Design an enzyme around this catalytic site. Structure first.
Site, short mmCIF file in Angstrom:
data_model
loop_
_atom_site.label_atom_id
_atom_site.label_comp_id
_atom_site.label_asym_id
_atom_site.label_seq_id
_atom_site.Cartn_x
_atom_site.Cartn_y
_atom_site.Cartn_z
N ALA A 9 0.80 -1.23 0.00
CA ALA A 9 0.00 0.00 0.00
C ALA A 9 0.84 1.28 0.00
CB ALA A 9 -0.96 0.01 1.18
N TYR A 10 1.82 1.35 0.90
CA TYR A 10 2.68 2.54 1.08
C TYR A 10 4.05 2.40 0.40
CZ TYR A 10 -0.87 3.43 4.62
OH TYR A 10 -2.08 3.56 5.26
N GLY A 11 4.09 1.71 -0.74
CA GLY A 11 5.35 1.32 -1.39
C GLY A 11 5.99 0.16 -0.64
N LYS A 24 11.00 1.91 5.20
CA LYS A 24 10.51 2.14 3.84
C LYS A 24 11.69 2.21 2.88
CE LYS A 24 7.95 5.03 0.71
NZ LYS A 24 6.53 5.11 0.27
N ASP A 122 -3.77 15.86 -0.26
CA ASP A 122 -4.10 14.45 -0.42
C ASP A 122 -4.49 13.79 0.91
OD1 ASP A 122 -4.52 12.07 -1.94
OD2 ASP A 122 -2.45 11.42 -1.66
C1 LIG Z 1 -0.18 -0.18 8.92
O1 LIG Z 1 1.24 -0.37 8.86
C2 LIG Z 1 2.00 0.71 8.53
C3 LIG Z 1 1.85 1.30 7.27
C4 LIG Z 1 2.61 2.38 6.92
C5 LIG Z 1 3.56 2.92 7.81
C6 LIG Z 1 4.38 4.04 7.51
C7 LIG Z 1 4.30 4.79 6.21
C8 LIG Z 1 3.55 6.08 6.52
C9 LIG Z 1 3.51 7.02 5.32
N1 LIG Z 1 4.87 7.16 4.77
C10 LIG Z 1 5.46 8.37 4.64
O2 LIG Z 1 4.91 9.41 4.95
C11 LIG Z 1 6.80 8.49 4.07
C12 LIG Z 1 7.88 8.73 4.92
C13 LIG Z 1 9.15 8.84 4.41
C14 LIG Z 1 9.38 8.72 3.04
O3 LIG Z 1 10.65 8.82 2.56
C15 LIG Z 1 11.04 10.01 1.89
F1 LIG Z 1 10.87 11.09 2.74
F2 LIG Z 1 12.38 9.90 1.55
F3 LIG Z 1 10.27 10.21 0.73
C16 LIG Z 1 8.31 8.47 2.18
C17 LIG Z 1 7.01 8.35 2.67
N2 LIG Z 1 5.95 8.09 1.80
C18 LIG Z 1 5.53 5.90 4.39
C19 LIG Z 1 5.68 5.10 5.67
N3 LIG Z 1 5.23 4.45 8.44
C20 LIG Z 1 5.34 3.86 9.62
N4 LIG Z 1 4.62 2.81 9.96
C21 LIG Z 1 3.72 2.31 9.10
C22 LIG Z 1 2.93 1.20 9.44
#
Ligand SMILES: COc1ccc2c(C3CCN(C(=O)c4ccc(OC(F)(F)F)cc4N)CC3)ncnc2c1
Length: 333
Positions: A9-11, A24, A122
């Site tokens: 979902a989140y990459g 990530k 978004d």
């Molecule tokens: C339900 O389980 C989850 C799902 C997503 C999680 C998550 C995501 C939450 C949204 N997110 C970000 O906001 C994000 C953060 C850094 C990033 O790196 C960059 F800055 F270099 F681009 C890119 C992103 N897109 C991905 C990480 N973080 C922590 N715990 C999570 C548990």
């Protein structure tokens, strides 16, 4: 050092044991201009903000390989157990007090974000992460922009393709040439309504159906708004349909909380200027239980998007990202 568990979902986000943390991976981070630009924005935004309702970067892994071979970025975050989409649309509780508290934290986060002249653009339940301590954190800043944007972007003109259709503000849908923090408050309205009924407020199948559904509740927009529509064909479509008064929110959500629907009504308006701000919404009686202005900070200085308006090559963007990773480590250690 870390050890990976399962793919969330989140990459490419993996659960990893160290206490548990989220890692990530941004694979092939410098191969596409748009992707690389987005990573640079996100890094700069998340390093700028320091707020308990905004996702924070805990660590970034530096290149083990030589610079040329550095292809993928690894970002470490605090592990969140769930997100607001999964909470809403599942068997777990969601009382009025859950709604109240989740809304409070979102708005607290937005007041801070908005005071730095950052529009998320978004906001939706799946970008609102919730840890096991019930802390709501705003994530996924890839779509975020300032009040000023470069003409070089396709989104500058094609505003109706910005972000997710179900949560997209009328100003973006209709290209009303007024793109402010109010964009996010429309989205908050949609999220708030979705929390109250546990179903999406405006689940449109396409551009036109999305406008239909918005009008079925809000009524036909005013002449000032209709004339502000850029596309003659959208303008003509709206004028072709018969007149419609707004449906009261009491009817849309039978038996719902009065102060909640009061606050909701101040968010879901056609005109960006008519909508309550994040700061002002925190002062609404619905959030009086949690509201404390001393514990609800603004962000200073403002965030500047100038770096994103530059026409940089892939390699120049790689250099900027690596400088951000170096700077991340240089500030602390
Ligand atoms: C339900 O389980 C989850 C799902 C997503 C999680 C998550 C995501 C939450 C949204 N997110 C970000 O906001 C994000 C953060 C850094 C990033 O790196 C960059 F800055 F270099 F681009 C890119 C992103 N897109 C991905 C990480 N973080 C922590 N715990 C999570 C548990």
């Amino acid at each position: 050092e870390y050890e990976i568990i399962e793919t969330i979902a989140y990459g490419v986000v993996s659960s990893a044991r160290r206490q548990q943390v989220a890692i990530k991976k941004i694979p092939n981070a410098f191969d596409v201009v748009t992707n690389a630009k987005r990573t640079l924005r996100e890094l700069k935004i998340l390093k700028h903000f320091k707020h308990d309702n905004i996702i924070a970067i805990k660590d970034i892994l530096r290149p083990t390989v030589p610079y040329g071979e550095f292809k993928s970025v690894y970002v470490v975050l605090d592990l969140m157990e769930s997100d607001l989409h999964q909470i809403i649309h599942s068997s777990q509780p969601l009382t009025l007090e859950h709604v109240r508290y989740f809304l409070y934290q979102l708005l607290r986060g937005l007041k801070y974000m908005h005071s730095a002249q950052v529009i998320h653009r978004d906001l939706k339940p799946s970008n609102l992460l919730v840890n096991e301590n019930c802390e709501l954190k705003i994530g996924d800043f890839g779509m975020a922009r300032g009040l000023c944007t470069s003409p070089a972007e396709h989104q500058y003109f094609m505003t109706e393709y910005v972000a997710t259709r179900w949560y997209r503000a009328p100003e973006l849908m209709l290209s009303l040439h007024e793109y402010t923090q109010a964009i996010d408050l429309w989205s908050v309205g949609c999220i708030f309504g979705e929390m109250l009924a546990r179903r999406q407020l405006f689940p449109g199948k396409n551009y036109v159906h999305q406008l239909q559904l918005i009008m079925m509740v809000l009524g036909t927009p005013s002449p000032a708004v209709i004339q502000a529509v850029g596309a003659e064909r959208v303008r003509a479509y709206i004028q072709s349909l018969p007149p419609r008064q707004p449906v009261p929110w009491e009817t849309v959500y039978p038996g719902a909380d009065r102060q909640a629907l009061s606050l909701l009504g101040r968010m879901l308006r056609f005109e960006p200027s008519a909508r309550i701000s994040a700061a002002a919404a925190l002062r609404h009686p619905f959030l009086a239980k949690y509201h404390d202005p001393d514990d609800e900070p603004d962000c200073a200085p403002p965030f500047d998007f100038a770096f994103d308006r530059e026409a940089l090559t892939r390699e120049r963007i790689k250099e900027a990202i690596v400088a951000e990773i170096e700077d991340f480590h240089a500030r602390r250690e």
